[PDB]
Every structure is written in C-alpha cells, then in structure tokens.
Design a binder for this molecule. Structure first.
Ligand SMILES: N[C@@H](Cc1c[nH]c2ccccc12)C(=O)O
Length: 454
C-alpha cells in the first residue's frame, strides 16, 4: 500500500531557495536540483532515508544502523534494493514524487562496455552515489507552488502528521545563524596536442568521426562550495543545475543538457551540438542564430549526434516509435546559443531503469561517434579518469520515472581543491592549439564563478 502523499502550498521561488540554504546548513548530506533558467522544477532533498555508494564492483546501501553490500553492476545492485520501495504514480504530484537523487560517474560506463584500465583514478569518485528520499520539497516554477511530499503505507493521518512537520520546517522563517591532498597534473599543452594528432590519425583511418578530448584544471578552494554555486547561478543560470554536498566532496553543476528522461513510457533525449556566443544587441542575436543555423559543418555535426541518439534510444524503444519531434532549434542560454534537437521513443515493455542507462549512457554528445570506439580512444589518451565529468546527475523515481543531465560546466570540490573539466570536439581538420584553447574557453563560467566568490 506504499504511496506518496503530498501538500501543495503557494510559494515564491526566492523564498524556496533561501529556505533551502538555511535548512541545508545543519545537514551533512543534501542536494538541490535547480531550474535556474528554463525548466519547471527545483528539487530539495535534505534528510535521506539511505545513502547508495558504488565503486569498483562493490555497492553499499546505508539505511539507519544497516549497511547492505553486494558485488556486481552497482546500478543493478541498487535497482534490486530500490524496487522494494516502488510506488504507483500520483498524476497530481510533480514528475519527481520521491526516490534517489545523485550521480552516475562517467566511469559507470566500465560496467556497460569493456574498458581498458589506462587512465589514473586519483580522485576516487564513486561510480554511483545516490541520496534516497521519502521526504522532499519540489518547487513548481510554472504554478509558483511548493510541493511537500512524504511516503506512507495504508495509514493516512500518519501522512498528515509528517506533512505538518515538513510544512513547519519549510514555511517557518529560520533565525540569523552563522555561516589538503595530492593529485595528478592537468593534461599538458604538449600532451593534449599529441592526443589531438592521434585522434585525427584514428579519424583518417575510419575508426571514429569525432572525439571530445578534455582537460582537468584545479585551484585551491578558498570559499565554501555553496558560495561558488550561488555565484554560478548568477554568472550562468541553466535548466539542469545541481548542488550536492557530502563531507568528502561537493558538486557545483551548471549543466544546460538533458541526457534522458522517462515519464510513463515516453523517453526523451535533448542532444546539444553547435554553439555561438550571444550578441550585444538582441538583433545581432537574430543574425548570430541565423548564421549558426545556415552553417553546414555545425548542421553536419548536429545531425550525426541526433542519429547516434536515435540509435541509443532505439535500443529500448518499441520499433518505429523513435521520432525527432523538435529538429535543430536554436535555443539561447545565458551567454551562448546552441543547436538543440528533441528525440522521443516509447519504452518497450520489459526494459527497466538499468537497461535505459545502459542504452544512452554516457551521452553521445560528450564522447563521439561511434560511441564505444570513441570511449576506447578517450581512455587511451586522457591521463586521468573523467569521474563526474560527462557523467550524469539526476533522479530515479520510486514510480520508475527518471531524469538525468550531462555533467559539463561543473566544479567537483574534494581534498581542498576545486576541479573543473572541459573538452573540445576533435575532427579530421582540428588544429591542436585551437582545441586546447577551446577547452579553456568552455571552463570560463567556472573559473569566473570561483574568482568572483573571492
Ligand atoms: N530542469 C528539470 C529539473 C532539474 C533541475 N536540475 C536538474 C539536474 C538534473 C536533473 C534534473 C534537473 C525539470 O524542470 O524537469
């Protein structure tokens, strides 16, 4: 009889964000998924019922005094436990009605494809990490309402008591309250350049069409990570932002990109590929958008990545159900514009959350085409494990819905350092120095956010 029970309250976005900051201060582990520019929902998880950590074939589920552990595919280990908490969808509640919020490391891909063990794991990022929530606050930006949601079995005055405690917590103004390690070096310029030349050799030879090659920069963290998040929200607000805090690492995510969503049977992915800086004039913007959309090399790159996503979603979709409902729109983000497409499919009966992740993860747009060969080349060339970079942050619903971003425009804070990773799409005619500089430019929002925070 397990089901979600929710209360809808009129509420202001800024009240929600301020109350989150105040409440989260007393919580060792918490997460915010924020729609800071576009998007409908912002999701606060304060008090987890469980912590799920998977690394190198071992998964731990910490739930009160109990720590459950099992070997194998960490997501399969997670799913077999998580299935016991499954619920029916309440169509009155938001898309997220309770469940797991966290991340899949890029290195979760090692359970999907056979990877060589070449790149150095110096950050020891979990392969999966989820906070599981019966109790959540979901802000609906479209209805300007706060949903407070709990879970019960059978008993319905049980629900009302818990919802009253959540109301007390969220609708009561909170008092005025007060507020090292050694890692591998970045890819050198010479190292990156020699890797660009190696990728071009593989392209010439017909192994791949395009590879995202990335560089990991780091600075000393001199301010609280949440301050960096608040700055990034100002510098570059995005529809798939996230802040996740634990004692060992914090994540400051400014992603604009959806990897995959599932609402009932409907699967969607939203590949972004092709870019220009916004104009000064908001008419310059029309002409820059017009230039981007008439640019045959950006269109070719975009169509290639849409085909790759069609094939990925096709692996778990009813035959003939995969459609591009939105093909090659320009969408203006805070400081750039992108070519963006929307790819939909109907989930074939018998495929579950793990099957969907195995089909689409990691995203085509941050590896290359074809994906499996591209990941082999990345692993051969990049000196360090990607970890969270080009992984996915999001949620698994108890009702079997899900929603994951792609981790780009993200700072990972651990061991007194802030880590910032960005890449460039290497192609047949790439100039090593151009792609090196292009990866530093992609890191601007994040180094800027850091500098402003002091
Ligand atoms: N933009 C999503 C919610 C969201 C915000 N940040 C996220 C990060 C990851 C996944 C989802 C999200 C929505 O409105 O539906």
């Amino acid at each position: 009889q397990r089901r979600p029970a929710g209360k809808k309250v009129p509420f202001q976005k800024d009240s929600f964000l301020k109350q989150f900051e105040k409440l989260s201060q007393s919580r060792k582990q918490h997460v915010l998924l924020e729609s800071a520019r576009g998007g409908r929902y912002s999701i606060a998880g304060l008090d987890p019922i469980a912590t799920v950590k998977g690394k190198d074939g071992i998964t731990t589920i910490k739930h009160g005094d109990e720590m459950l552990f099992k070997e194998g595919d960490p997501l399969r280990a997670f799913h077999s436990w998580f299935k016991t908490l499954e619920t029916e969808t309440d169509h009155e509640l938001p898309d997220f009605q309770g469940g797991a919020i966290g991340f899949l490391s890029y290195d979760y891909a090692r359970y999907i494809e056979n990877f060589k063990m070449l790149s150095l794991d110096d950050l020891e990022t979990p392969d999966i990490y989820f906070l599981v929530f019966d109790d959540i606050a979901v802000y609906d930006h479209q209805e300007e309402s706060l949903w407070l949601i709990t879970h019960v079995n059978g008993t319905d005055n049980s629900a009302d008591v818990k919802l009253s405690e959540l109301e007390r917590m969220w609708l009561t103004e909170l008092p005025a309250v007060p507020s090292d390690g050694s890692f591998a070096a970045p890819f050198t310029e010479d190292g990156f350049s020699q890797a660009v030349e190696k990728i071009k050799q593989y392209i010439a030879s017909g192994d791949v069409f395009q590879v995202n090659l990335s560089i990991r920069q780091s600075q000393s963290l001199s301010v609280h990570p949440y301050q960096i998040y608040k700055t990034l929200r100002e510098v570059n607000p995005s529809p798939y932002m996230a802040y996740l805090e634990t004692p060992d690492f914090q994540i400051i995510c400014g992603s604009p990109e959806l990897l995959v969503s599932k609402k009932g049977k409907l699967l969607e992915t939203r590949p972004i590929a092709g870019t220009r800086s916004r104009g000064k004039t908001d008419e310059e913007d029309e002409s820059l958008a017009n230039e981007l959309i008439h640019n045959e090399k950006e269109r070719a790159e975009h169509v290639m990545l849409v085909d790759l996503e069609r094939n990925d979603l096709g692996r778990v979709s009813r035959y003939g159900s995969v459609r591009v409902n939105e093909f090659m729109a320009i969408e203006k983000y805070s400081h750039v514009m992108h070519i963006v497409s929307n790819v939909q499919g109907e989930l074939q009966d018998g495929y579950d959350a793990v099957d969907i992740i195995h089909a689409v993860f990691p995203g085509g747009t941050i590896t290359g085409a074809p994906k499996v060969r591209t990941m082999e080349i990345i692993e051969e060339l990049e000196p360090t494990r990607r970890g969270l970079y080009t992984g996915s942050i999001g949620w698994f619903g108890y009702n079997h819905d899900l929603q994951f971003n792609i981790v780009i425009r993200t700072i990972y804070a651990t061991g007194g350092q802030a880590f910032m990773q960005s890449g460039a799409g290497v192609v047949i005619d790439s100039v090593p120095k151009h792609e090196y500089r292009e990866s530093f430019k992609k890191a601007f929002a994040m180094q800027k956010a850091l500098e402003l925070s002091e």
